[PDB]
Write a protein that binds this ligand. Structure first.
Ligand SMILES: N#Cc1cn([C@@H]2O[C@H](CSCC[C@H](N)C(=O)O)[C@@H](O)[C@H]2O)c2ncnc(N)c12
Ligand SMILES: [Zn+2]
Length: 261
């Protein structure tokens, strides 16, 4: 089974997630009561312990807890589709909005979008929609096109191209890509969080990937710390599901920091 708050792979587990795992296994298997701090570590460290270490920490259930973890590793749980759907929209909005602010593309070519929906409606950019099979109710504002690099590598050179879960043979250089040799023109997109929303004072967040105005001095406000952690869960939930993010090579996070001056 699964408790719906341990659905990600154990490598993504936090210290509190491990405590929930011990408490969940205490009732699911009628194990003897065990203190939460018996395994005071994150999931990334719990995977480095030996089975002998489990017995030393928990003489009554250490061997049972170890074998339970192995089956979790051998058979990863499936994430909820709606939560994965929400995670994909949140990451898509974050990445595209940041890219448009960083490099100020005059036009966006959304390739693979059959519903003519902008993920960044306030972007102030010419939004173009392309799809091989446009929806009937949106085809009037969608160009019917099947993208192939051998056919269109000389097209859509202006602005940026968006291939969000649009698996094509090879992406052009000016691309923003999510996918579940084709990325030779691109680079991997590292994790980051960007927010231009106002700060509000009502655990201190230490991270160089929190691109917020309050983090210029290292003091992330409560509002952006909570939004950062909610986004990180969505990012991890999407990476755990087998999605990878790729971007044009000149993408630079320092362009996002310059938006605060
Ligand atoms: N292979 C391939 C191709 C598949 N698509 C379209 O991309 C979509 C993938 S599902 C929706 C993805 C959307 N960007 C979203 O963010 O939800 C479908 O509508 C499919 O018809 C294509 N379109 C243009 N040229 C192609 N070469 C393909
Ligand atoms: Zn802030």
């Amino acid at each position: 089974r699964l408790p719906a708050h341990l659905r990600l792979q154990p490598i993504y587990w936090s210290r509190d997630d491990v405590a929930q795992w011990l408490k969940w296994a205490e009732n699911e298997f009628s194990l003897r009561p065990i203190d939460s701090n018996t395994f005071e570590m994150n999931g990334k460290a719990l995977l480095l312990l030996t089975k002998e270490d489990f017995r030393y920490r928990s003489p009554h259930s250490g061997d049972e807890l170890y074998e339970l973890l192995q089956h979790i590793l051998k058979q990863p749980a499936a994430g909820d589709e709606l939560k994965i759907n929400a995670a994909c929209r949140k990451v898509q909005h974050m990445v595209v909005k940041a890219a448009l602010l960083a490099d100020k593309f005059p036009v966006l070519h959304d390739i693979g979008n059959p519903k003519a929906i902008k993920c960044v409606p306030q972007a102030d950019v010419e939004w173009k929609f392309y799809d091989a099979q446009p929806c009937s109710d949106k085809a009037y504002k969608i160009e019917e096109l099947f993208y192939s690099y051998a056919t269109h590598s000389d097209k859509f050179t202006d602005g940026v191209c968006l291939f969000w879960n649009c698996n094509v043979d090879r992406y052009p250089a000016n691309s923003i890509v999510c996918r579940f040799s084709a990325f030779v023109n691109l680079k991997q997109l590292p994790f980051f969080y960007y927010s231009d929303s106002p700060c509000e004072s009502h655990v201190p967040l230490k991270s160089a990937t929190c691109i917020t105005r309050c983090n210029l001095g290292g003091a992330v406000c409560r509002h952006h710390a909570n939004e950062y952690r909610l986004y990180l869960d969505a990012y991890n939930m999407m990476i755990s599901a087998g999605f990878s993010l790729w971007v044009y090579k000149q993408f630079d996070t320092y362009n996002l920091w310059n938006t605060f001056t």
